[PDB]
Design an enzyme around this catalytic site. Structure first.
Site, PDB file in Angstrom:
ATOM      1  N   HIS A 184      -7.458   9.649  -1.957  1.00 46.28           N
ATOM      2  CA  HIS A 184      -6.857   9.582  -0.628  1.00 46.28           C
ATOM      3  C   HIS A 184      -7.750  10.172   0.449  1.00 46.28           C
ATOM      4  O   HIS A 184      -7.841   9.640   1.553  1.00 46.28           O
ATOM      5  CB  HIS A 184      -5.494  10.287  -0.628  1.00 46.28           C
ATOM      6  CG  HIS A 184      -4.536   9.767   0.404  1.00 46.28           C
ATOM      7  ND1 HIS A 184      -3.182   9.661   0.174  1.00 46.28           N
ATOM      8  CD2 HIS A 184      -4.742   9.328   1.670  1.00 46.28           C
ATOM      9  CE1 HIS A 184      -2.591   9.177   1.253  1.00 46.28           C
ATOM     10  NE2 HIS A 184      -3.516   8.968   2.173  1.00 46.28           N
ATOM     11  N   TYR A 231       3.311  10.024   0.624  1.00 44.41           N
ATOM     12  CA  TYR A 231       4.337   9.453   1.503  1.00 44.41           C
ATOM     13  C   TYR A 231       5.740   9.836   1.009  1.00 44.41           C
ATOM     14  O   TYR A 231       6.721   9.724   1.748  1.00 44.41           O
ATOM     15  CB  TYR A 231       4.210   7.929   1.645  1.00 44.41           C
ATOM     16  CG  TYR A 231       2.834   7.419   2.035  1.00 44.41           C
ATOM     17  CD1 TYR A 231       1.867   8.271   2.542  1.00 44.41           C
ATOM     18  CD2 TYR A 231       2.507   6.078   1.888  1.00 44.41           C
ATOM     19  CE1 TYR A 231       0.607   7.806   2.865  1.00 44.41           C
ATOM     20  CE2 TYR A 231       1.254   5.607   2.225  1.00 44.41           C
ATOM     21  CZ  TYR A 231       0.308   6.473   2.712  1.00 44.41           C
ATOM     22  OH  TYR A 231      -0.937   6.005   3.046  1.00 44.41           O
ATOM     23  N   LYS A 241      -2.503   6.242  -4.219  1.00 45.19           N
ATOM     24  CA  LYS A 241      -3.577   7.147  -3.839  1.00 45.19           C
ATOM     25  C   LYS A 241      -3.359   8.547  -4.430  1.00 45.19           C
ATOM     26  O   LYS A 241      -2.227   9.038  -4.509  1.00 45.19           O
ATOM     27  CB  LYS A 241      -3.671   7.240  -2.307  1.00 45.19           C
ATOM     28  CG  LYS A 241      -3.614   5.906  -1.569  1.00 45.19           C
ATOM     29  CD  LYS A 241      -3.921   6.098  -0.090  1.00 45.19           C
ATOM     30  CE  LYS A 241      -3.579   4.851   0.736  1.00 45.19           C
ATOM     31  NZ  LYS A 241      -2.130   4.562   0.837  1.00 45.19           N
ATOM     32  N   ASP A 256       0.830  -1.197   0.000  1.00 49.73           N
ATOM     33  CA  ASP A 256       0.000   0.000   0.000  1.00 49.73           C
ATOM     34  C   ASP A 256       0.864   1.246   0.000  1.00 49.73           C
ATOM     35  O   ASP A 256       1.650   1.457   0.921  1.00 49.73           O
ATOM     36  CB  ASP A 256      -0.950   0.014   1.195  1.00 49.73           C
ATOM     37  CG  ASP A 256      -1.804   1.270   1.242  1.00 49.73           C
ATOM     38  OD1 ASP A 256      -2.857   1.311   0.566  1.00 49.73           O
ATOM     39  OD2 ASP A 256      -1.419   2.222   1.956  1.00 49.73           O
TER      40      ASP A 256
END
Ligand code: NAP
Ligand code: UV8
Length: 316
Positions: free
Chosen positions: A111, A49, A78, A44
């Site tokens: 997201h 990130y 996402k 994931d």
């Protein structure tokens, strides 16, 4: 080697995946490599990130050395809410796919349901730190995401942090091309999401549980905040099976047919977190765990309640 949850597209989503939020550069590559060796087939990821380039390096490495075939991997990323405007959706996705060194994603998620000020400031906010909204909506974004599926760049679309009202708004949109195959939300014994899971399942939508361990390393954690890993009633159940609390917290989701994505960069823990297919929580144990529901969120650092489509006010 994990069991699966079948999507509405008949694709098989591995029921345990590896989370990568706050996995540092220099540790996340090793994290992904250890996970694939340990049997993880679901990773994931997210643009936000800012580590997908290192995840991509690890995935490609393991495909090169024949540890795993692409078609046996299930890769999710996402779309961040500063990219809901149509042309930004494409550009954002392209960077994500470029960083991951992939030719397609298995699932691409919205997201967060609220749109933020468009552009490459990922956290646009006022002085007091409240989010600055943008005019593009999650429906605008979905429209652009559907193109990616038309082009074969994404196998299926999904949502994250959506209440059932927002999923209704999506499902009831006239002229919808593709339906969400999953809703990724926080889920654990303190936030059992019973109504939301029941809703999603009735609509053919799976649920992916994030922060299944209570995200113990979250920066905004107060010692008053409950801790799942240290919870005596969780630890009792773990002891009964000679398993760890973490293993119980993960297995809880498996037995509800809910996908779960624990994050680790620690090789021992990565392996530990997938050793959850050799025991079973009794019905009474599941009942006991479900009773812990507090409606408590580890994850709502978002001072974004003042914007439209805030998902966490609704009952579910
Ligand atoms: N869609 C969204 O909005 C959203 C939001 C949050 C998270 N997510 C996704 O969900 C994933 C998981 O949630 P999370 O990262 O917030 O928190 P989490 O998985 O509940 O917990 C991760 C923390 O627990 C530690 N840990 C992992 N396994 C352990 C074990 N067996 N024993 C003791 N400690 C253990 C990790 O330490 P080490 O890493 O140091 O080993 C890390 O500090 C994320 O990585 C991300 O992919 C999505
Ligand atoms: C950290 C972040 C949200 C976030 C981060 C990670 C994940 C995840 O999927 O793991 C998921 C999510 Br969701 C965020 C969002 C908005 C804002 C901030 C952080 C700060 C605190 C920097 C300032 C204010 C605003 C509101 C702009």
């Amino acid at each position: 080697m994990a069991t699966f949850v079948e999507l509405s597209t008949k694709a098989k989503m591995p029921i345990v995946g590896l989370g990568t939020w706050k996995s540092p550069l220099g540790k996340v590559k090793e994290a992904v490599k250890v996970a694939i060796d340990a049997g993880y087939r679901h990773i994931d990821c997210a643009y936000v990130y800012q580590n997908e380039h290192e995840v991509g390096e690890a995935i490609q490495e393991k495909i090169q050395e024949k540890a795993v075939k692409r078609e046996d991997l299930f890769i999710v990323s996402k779309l961040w809410p500063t990219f809901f405007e149509r042309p930004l959706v494409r550009k954002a996705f392209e960077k994500t796919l470029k960083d991951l060194k992939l030719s397609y994603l298995d699932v691409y998620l919205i997201h967060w349901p609220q749109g933020f000020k468009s552009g490459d400031d990922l956290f646009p906010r006022d002085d007091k730190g409240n989010a600055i909204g943008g005019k593009a909506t999650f429906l605008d974004a979905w429209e652009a995401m559907e193109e990616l599926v038309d082009e074969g760049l994404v196998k299926a679309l999904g949502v994250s942090n959506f209440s059932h009202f927002q999923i209704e708004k999506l499902l009831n949109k006239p002229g919808l091309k593709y339906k969400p195959v999953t809703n990724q939300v926080e889920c654990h014994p303190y936030l059992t999401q019973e109504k939301l899971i029941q809703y999603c399942h009735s609509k053919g939508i799976t649920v992916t549980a994030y922060s299944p361990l209570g995200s113990p390393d979250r920066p905004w954690a107060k010692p008053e905040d409950p801790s799942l890993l240290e919870d005596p009633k969780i630890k009792e159940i773990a002891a009964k099976h000679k398993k760890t609390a973490a293993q119980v917290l993960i297995r809880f989701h498996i037995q509800r047919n809910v996908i779960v994505i624990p994050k680790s960069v620690t090789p021992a823990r990565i392996v530990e977190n997938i050793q959850v297919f050799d025991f079973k929580l009794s019905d009474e144990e599941m009942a006991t765990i479900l009773s812990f529901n507090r409606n408590w969120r580890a994850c709502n650092l978002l001072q974004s309640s003042h914007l439209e489509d805030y998902p966490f006010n609704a009952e579910y």
